[model samples]
Target: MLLEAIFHEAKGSYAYPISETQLRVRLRAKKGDVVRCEVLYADRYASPEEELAHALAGKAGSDERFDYFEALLECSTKRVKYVFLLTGPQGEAVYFGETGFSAERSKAGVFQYAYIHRSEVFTTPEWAKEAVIYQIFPERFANGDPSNDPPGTEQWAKDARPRHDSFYGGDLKGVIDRLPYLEELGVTALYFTPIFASPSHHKYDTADYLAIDPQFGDLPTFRRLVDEAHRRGIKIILDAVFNHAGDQFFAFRDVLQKGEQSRYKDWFFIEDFPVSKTSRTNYETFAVQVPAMPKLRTENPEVKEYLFDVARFWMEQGIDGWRLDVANEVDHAFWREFRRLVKSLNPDALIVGEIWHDASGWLMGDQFDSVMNYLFRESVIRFFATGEIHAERFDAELTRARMLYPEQAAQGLWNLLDSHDTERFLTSCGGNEAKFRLAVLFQMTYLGTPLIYYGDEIGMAGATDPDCRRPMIWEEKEQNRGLFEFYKELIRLRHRLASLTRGNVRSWHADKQANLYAFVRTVQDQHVGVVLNNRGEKQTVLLQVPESGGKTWLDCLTGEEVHGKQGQLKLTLRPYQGMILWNGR
Candidate 1:
């Protein structure tokens, strides 16, 4: 497998060098496995050194400690070690010594890997551990003042919040009106989908990145929303799109009419064609071969400058941060500098990228604060419901991510179970009635920043994209009230018990048949335990908590007391229920 490993030898020393004949005799390495040694020979010879190749069981980290030169090891395992061995005169292997260190410790989950540099050792950040995020689809969240909603006539630009063309009227001002609603969710930050001026409700094909969409509200309303949100101790972030622009946008239209002469014509990636509705062939656009939204070749200098202005414009406007749309597809050069530029405005301003798969490629500190953590979320959901997990070592995946990343990233990389892009959690659980409660309890208390889509807390269920993007059902604001209360209580529990969100995590134990799952999080100040019933039936567990002494638990919702002592805590949880216990010491 092409594992992202970073391995090398110590400074001024080779890592396990042997000859071809010795490799066969002294180091019979496995086939197809690779062992990279300290960069031995250069074009210019400083000293006559023997060429080195790696063997399966050579002198690779037998006992000595490594100090410098990082390396990348491939086709390796725990049972045997591979190192660079020397080739003999007639294609034979020779016996060689071990490199001071092999990448075994770094390859193991005990540490993380780096990318840019071929080193596997790095430290983690402190702040990222406690951050849980909340995602908001602004257009359908709330309408603080309906009078501010703008009028538009585009047939495709109808109100999506209503499922048809009807007006549910959720706007930026509406989100502003619900700051307290978000604060109650126990999220450390708020991420809003594109809030710019557009004919469409989704706003991907932005007409103007600088202006707020008319259907939502005016620019002042946006400022008011951001300011009010900040007053409630909230960190607000807007979605930034640098990849494309709407067809009717001024830049695209000018480039079409004036060819290369328009001052802004150089700004857009123009297709080599005339601007008639019937023209085909050379037309370049996304969302099919339509000319409505042209793709901007982001490598162009003019395009990069304009996009940079869009990010800085919000930072100057006092908006807290930005969530990049299709961050992977956007220009990496732009992102590298964009991160430095945005942080210049607010040192703490966050850059959350939209990366669903492996974000290790671009998630270093200089590129993004964090990527949408789909890995842990996907793993937990599948594991809880089906009892299947790909890799058991919970922390082993980071083979090449930590090289360029700082401590801030390890703790800040956020995770989410449901968002605007996928199926709702309740619906994903088949709305089996039992799974919804169990999954919600699981998500709210688990690691990373748990982001609740607009109506997830109050029992809203749908499948994929627009269907999952349903409007807020205020009618049941009082009905499914128990679930909402549970959500609120979980948020409070995460905050009040610092160890729950701010500590080191360890799985205390798990029993799939009994549907019991438990874990402990310990920090400098407190220790917390979370026990959840993963099955539809009620679960009773007698867990062995190695640190359970002189402590009792205060269930946030019921104000009940749980007993603990002598490296043990006996727990009794209801059907699809959980209990987060802290020191009622």
Candidate 2:
């Protein structure tokens, strides 16, 4: 056997939790090198023949020169030790485990997933899985109470560019008044940016951690908003800005006043003796030379306990969870404790981190339930927007992304086309609504918690932050109702499709030159396929229907059905069109 070609570990993507009681194991082997591979698994201390279970793993997918194989181990008593039995094409044999390949099956050498603790399992809120999240910038979503509008606040801009310095008086009451609109659009969850007391229109620099910004609303009003949303079956997730605090924050204010004598000097990352207000301050801020927002020293035990207390307080207030702001900047220890405290209050609370790069470190079930999947965002933009990458590359990129994290965390990722930090998806596609629709179709069908930036569903277009933060247009005629309806339809479809939300994702087909990509999702043997045509012209792509021996496959999007015999199914996707299909077996 090519022992070096075989690779498997009982950690990370190699072996991870699929559910509280189920675990999936995968291995990488040289292409066409292994004839058969079987997984030998048993609880710790169980005898081989008496209690051991052997599972036959089949080929899952392949890339370049390697083949991927997978097997699902049903762990009943919560503890399992597993090893792989690989048979090469030349009848060569080997047993692979935690300590690498060995000729003998020594129990100590087995790859052991010692115990699946409920706290350690990557479990997200069940409601978040099937949710269509609508991200609302509180100050730009609505203006229900004109009486409480901030002084010098600009009027709502229907078609004008937005500025971070300007406010439109959108408040919690505004969100309360617009619940009907969200209900009409079929939004299951609402994600709010920071509503804490702050100076700027964009409230990233938090002044008071315990109170709501008067411009947005008070605590009572927010409580009412939460209760009303709950009554409407909508889960509310707030943004927790703990990485830094505004210069006006009481602790920071004390530091500025008392200089080195302040009792709260340890709250922030201050350098030298006296903290400077003018010139370059000897303190760590959010960005380079941005002294208005000083970074917090989260390593301080007081800060950690304070933030942990803040986390518990919100869950006690009935908010479902949090979308952590600048979570990447905070220390891992803070988040580990944050998760412990947050989950202790409400295990169903979803903790989403704001991470734009490779986020495998924060997704190990100890830190975040999921992250804002910016990797998924960029790939979709490159393929569907700039046409920089072809269909095969897109498929390969997406496949690598799915394989990067555990299946449970991957599905719970906060997948968005655009957010307050980037240009709107429509603008990214250069006003090509077809490409945007394709992106949306993929976002909804692919595993993740799909989010719609504030004005995205209504065909809002802008370039980056401040621009993406424009006041949402409420005028029916000014909005693109067709696109809105499509969003509504997609959300409705996603809610009823278990295979799309909670199933295992695997690549079914891809074409480099033809710009066609397809994949299938399966949950409890119910299979669904998503096929996309990125090219401008019509094309026929052969979809491999491995599960369809003689069953009928039907398109859930267009009511189209097909009959394929044993293996291949041909689909003619229209120009820039995609189909969501399922096997009617």
Candidate 3:
């Protein structure tokens, strides 16, 4: 009966509108403490005696310290008031509300949700919610046009490692050439990292926001790429490097040539007169004293207009969305305006910020629809790659990460196992193919939109940074066909099964000693179960399938049939293997 653990809030993830006629409410309590919880609610104008009550179902989400309870309230009137009544393990009751906890419901302060404005509801693009995203590093994916290769460009080599300055002539034409491959892989969206004009191979330091990098291609090439992708039902997302500009940028170059008197001096943050690109730079940059990259002053009106214009130009060019670079460093007001402008142009255009932590402040129906979801990457790395945590801890960590945002934001999160910023998942697993396969299985079956880093599907392995940015493998003999097939199949399964893409997740089983974890995704009557065995030896697990009723389940990986006895299903998993079981309705 830990009263201190009982918790609820009237806003953010705790309370949000699923629709104009429905509102979702959630509560948290110490694990195993609250046996039952219910919410009593009515229109704000209704008398307390007229309130109706509904039981809150305990969610499969539980962390090391707490358990979550959730319920959706149907409201005829948009405005509503509510309070929670919780029953502890000992049958003792407590009332929770806006003010605090109380012994009596009458003593609790009522939580009032003033009204649900249709436009104000936290909603994400329906297309993005179910999209399977494939992130491509332009300079490394493929070299379709050899003539556009940058000076000092190296030969396309599957075995050769890449340096920070190395370029392999990859371009928009290369992406356009690979459209059929992407279509075969079944990805619905492509997220390209900074393809605008830049001096470096990784185009984070933008030199010109208006033009595509000549090394990549020209306007016509980009237009063709977008048009071709759209023709294939694939959406295009470009990186917006608004946080900083390259030293070679026209504005920065002008400032360098004219000292403080340059007309565009206000575009950047200059600390002292006579701007110098010395060891100690006279201006602020993306990282301390990086002479190549200068941070932009987004708060300045002119700067805002320039960046916004760049965004509008790309949207007009038919890009489906923008993935903001170093997003947390920019001001929130800028993002708010950016959202309004992008949504005005195309309501379905997604806005994903590169925030690596808790980004609740930016996702309150005002700013980004989603972020990079690096936290999910970290959890997956720990559980599958490093094995630093067991199954129970892994489940807890995942649950905590998902609970950080509203349900819509969670659905739009970009779940990636590895990216250009980190070591490849295969490398992180010490070249263990089985571990990498298991991680991929979990990623495809988990919540959010799964993001596959380029070359990852073909079993590419690299350490970090420059190493991880190696050129994509084009030689069939050099690629791991088995891993590629695994990814392709999992993606097909995700697209074919509504439960895997749109269902709510619930933990059905977890055993720390056996190193096994199982969860089920359910949408309406469709159910899909994912079971993982992290151990090296084959293990048998008896999964408790709630309401299964002796149903037959199909293994998505092998197309074998499994039957449930009473309410449990016995499954055998090989070393570091994961199974996707679907009870095809």
Candidate 4:
């Protein structure tokens, strides 16, 4: 199916209900289909290239568009977009004059328009800066319902790969039952991995975006979950996958069984029929054996519409936001519309992408708010704890990451250590509890959003995939209450001390030989310092406290005092000896 943009009036002269908006025309060709589109408007264009130079300041046309568009994009490929400028004959932006009452008319270019709703959108969220997000892979979280568990779920795994899929009982109700658990732990948002219907429990391979997997409970259960989360001062964020679908997907299955004559044939990137008599095709996959999961043909309008409807359905379910998966692999046109639509439902809703690459190119206003900060995690671990490199390289890596991202994107970075895909922090550090504690201290206090894996605070140990996703052991929380307490104190410090979380960081020293590193955080002189003395005695530092540094150096564990002014914040090494200090917020 093809999608087109027209100068509806045909005479090249038109009027919008609003006022002035700069307009330009461009053609977007995807999968050999023509998509005629143009720039609407943008606050910031990436660069100042004169060829297509249009610095958009306001709405695009008199027919309801604006002029001086800073940035706007038209579809370029299945997964990319090309930025454009709206200009006039003289090459100067034809901006309409803004009326104090309504949209003002522009003299030169076409005006910007409101696609679905003619209204301003919510720009910022109240909890965005201070919020904590807990991500749960549905089937693994906790089962509270068994009826929805499929009849043949146990056989669904790739070998003895997963728990017998017939509901181990985890459901929305189980999570609702534990609202206080998340609330008490200081999290304000919960991002559940896809709960939509699929063969696999993880649900990345979707059967129907509109329908929730019966195993995860249905609309009513979802409503109850959303209500409970909100009542407890928490919000729910759902996950959606636009890059692929399950073999049973309606559109693809129809195409497979019906052949080229099938109306749904264009919805997927099918190489050929997987089974001649069956409704399946050989689409792409991260791994060839994962046949059940097939990539979608997002370039088609029918495909784009289907994906857009998925976001719409969830928003109507009272979803506060979405955590898009394999987001970089999907078409940009899909997201361009989705970002606008989701925000329209609830301006407070967040739209975070799951991209491991440098996301700045995508994280700009039109794409994701933020991405998983793998670069930050790897750099910090290698430089500080494992001595992967010396001081200079560490500085460059950290500087490029922590000090460089746009403030909005920076605020949304998923600052974490040891997620479900990687080795647990403790195990990665060779199970030296000291190194684990030190690593945790550095990571949690560094920057962006600090996310603790469910069991890490309780000293859970594991390595890679399945191991990283172990069940949360409350007993460990009972025994190593110190670690738990340590987490609580650290969390409290982060939440209560504005200076510590938002402060600018300055790396004082990183001693690879001693396996020690020190960094200071200062918000206009209200300083906090973190001195980590690793598992050995050779690591030590004589840090000179700035006036912005806190007056009293209180030890978190000992509650001891240090000599004021010129004295040493002496260190004696125990395996994971961590020293944290904060004052004068």
Candidate 5:
């Protein structure tokens, strides 16, 4: 028994309410150390001895060091006090609780979850879980209305390399025109970078929260875009840059003019007497030395109301949700209120934070429903593109990342490869199409909503930031037709199979020497298995499929039958190849 390896917490991912009556609890033990595990739980008010024993099923999501066990307890009283009973391989048993391990059950201090409040239950929109998201940089997506083009806007070209200041005149009308393309691509949601009035092409610096950027079109055009998108059953999520405002913003302008006498002086962080944009910025901005983007004082009552009103106004304008910019930089209190207001308006509307690291703090059911899952992106890039880690390491990294949040929150995470802020995945892969395809296969089949950066489907490649924000490849000859077809088929598979979206992901197989990794997503009887070969040479691998009894498996991508003997399945995968196996017709 590895006494040091046994772990559990009273809250967060370890124990969280899935519903008003159901509480999901998880325990972690050293891999292959514990033979059996069970939870003795009851309402907090119930007598200590009057507890119900529920077996904790050993989950398939085992990493290199730990094996996970989970069980959902029904607490009709909306309260729970629990303890764990773990049995080792040699039949040695022990009790674990708040005070630590003990030989006797009574000695183990109880872990009490006072109550399962209805509002505290982590719930995300059902539609968001199954959504195939397509992220678009509006300025680079398309140019539908040349009349609305900004001054100095260059001609739209397929081979154009964009700079920080470049604009190709992509607008709302352009997105409306490309709705058919997105529809055919099988994306259910569109996440634009930022559409509100701003000076830059990316629009992260908010000049005006109430009006649409003229370069992107006016209010009527935006309404038409929303109506058209909704007609296609596609949801729209606009970016909310609430953390900072542009220097040209009304409040910032007022502060600069009135100095210390401005009523809006509390709106921003001004260090000294007069706000100066000279060599050293006197006020705090989004980044040091970037004077054009000034950070807002969200703690102030007036600032909070102004931002909340911005959210409400857009919700009324038919926008489905918001992707908060620099979300982590803003205070948690602001996000809590933002979530409440957004949910009050539309319970199904999503609030995604632009948090690149561990976002466990923000996803506790009271803040954002999800964040831009950059940790998932980093793991994918390291394993698939740079080969910085082998298959085993990749599995362990991903398993840890998934266990950071409750099951419901995990499903809503926006698993993206690359966005406007980072280098494209293909460019990171050194333009290796095969590697890119394998990564995309894993993304589409993995748990969480897959997000596709625009133009990635057509093999657009560039380094980070400005270079990655190139013009969309509209020419059929210039686009990667095969890659586009691949993306379309995988997206179709994602929508067609329920397991791919809402299933519990389990690490099925991994081989460090062969550079192979496999995982299975299961929702009841429906099962989807994905295998990838990251090595340069073809590899033959045997996988144990305990659930394959009397079941025929078919390759969802290639439309071919996969043969298996007893509980074993064998496959020969080419270099940088991936396979998605399904057990359904």
Candidate 6:
């Protein structure tokens, strides 16, 4: 037996609590080296000779040199001592435990894990999993209250191009007016960019954390928006820009006026006696020495207290949660307390961080429930739009990414194809609706909270940033009504399907020659098959179906049913076409 190839430790993703009464354990071995793996587990306090519980460890997946195996334990005692029994390719037997590899079966030195309480487990809110999130740039979505338009508001987008200074008078009243529209589109949650007082158009640099930006409206107006949204069963998530404050912010301005003598000097990371205005000076700032936006000294107790108050204030106002901006730049200790304060006030309130990369560090259930899934976005763009990666590579990359976090946190991940920060999805695919639709299909079907950037449903196209934040098109003639209809269908399907929401996802098949990807989502008896042909001619491919016997599968897009032949499904996909097939129900 290749003993060196076998590995297991009771920590991290390998050993973690899936729920209050459920513990999930994983093991790794050389690819195809183990024929069958069995988990031998028992209560930690059980006698050494006590009959142990045994269960088969299913094959999770493979990447390069190693294959991963996982087993789920439903422990009522809240504690478990476990070990793996490996059967090698040649039928050689070996026992892997915490102590070492052995030939004889021994309970001594077995791997043990205790199920922690729910407060310690990395859990996401249940409501978020069932939600369809819609992201809106408050300044561009609508202008319901012309009275609240910021000074020098330009004519509502004749050219559709935007600059840093441009504002089209989008306000809370606008969102309130559009609640029915959002409801019609099947959005259950609303995520908005910074609505706090700020000088710039983006509002990332907050001038005041407590007060709502006058351009957007006052606290009462926001309260009204929240009440109305909740009345329609839609949750609201506000952007939290606590990483930095605008130069015009009261504390920063006080520091600037009083220099080193200011009581608020410690509010920011001011290095020298006099802070630099234009030149790069001896003070910390957010990215590339932007003096107008100074980094806050979050470690300071006063700063922490003030931010906590701000967090609690919003939660008290009935806001669902916060989408923390630049969350990776802030200290983890601060976020730990922030989570405590927010969750204590409202346990169901969501806390999604703006971490563009691997955010495993923040998603331990103590800090953030989830993060913006930019890794998913990058993969979707490369595989679906640019064709930079083949179908097989896409599936592998996505699978590996999902395995980074526990299943619950993974489901709460904010999955987006485009945002106020990136180019529009349509523009990303160069106006190819078929390719774009395939990407949206994947996003909606994947395991995560799907976020649709404002105007995306109507096929709003832009390059990036300010352009992506273009005014939401209200006129039906100016929008891609067909694409809008397509989105409505997808959103309705997401609302109706259980396999897409609560099911476990596994890559079913990928064919490089045909540029096709197929994955199955299963939750008990319900199974869903999602297939995409990004770019290809009319071609037939024999796809593998969920082992539900030879049965008829319904095409969710066309309402057409096809019978599986000999445990294999034949698919004739057109170029840049996709299908969602249901095996039963």
Best by TM-score: 3
Better of 2 and 6 by TM-score: 6
Residue runs of model 5 more than 4 Å from their true location after superposition? 48-51, 547-550
User: Can you write out model 1's per-residue Cα lDDT over 64-157, one digit (the tens) per residue?
Assistant: 1121123333311211233333332344432222322233422221111112131222222333355556678875667666665546422222
TM-score of each: 0.72, 0.93, 0.97, 0.72, 0.97, 0.95
Error of 2 at 441 (Å): 1.2
Error of 5 at 285 (Å): 1.5
Candidate 5 steric clashes = 0
**Tens digit of per-residue lDDT, candidate 5, span 520-539:** 88888888889898989999
Q: Taking the candidates one at a time, how many backbone clashes does each contain?
A: 43, 0, 0, 49, 0, 0
Candidate 4 has its poorest 10 consecutive residues by lDDT at 60-69
Which pairs of residues collide in candidate 5?
none
- Model 3 TM: 0.97
C-alpha RMSD for every candidate: 10.2, 2.5, 1.5, 13.4, 1.7, 2.1
Residue 558 shift from truth in candidate 1, angstroms = 4.7
**91-144 per-residue lDDT for model 4 (tens digits):** 432222111111222222333332312232113354666666777756655545
Residue 455, model 4: Cα distance from true site in angstroms = 2.3
**Residue 234 Cα positional deviation in candidate 5, in Å, after optimal superposition:** 1.2
Candidates 2 and 3, the one with greater TM-score: 3
In model 3, what lDDT does residue 171 have?
Answer: 87
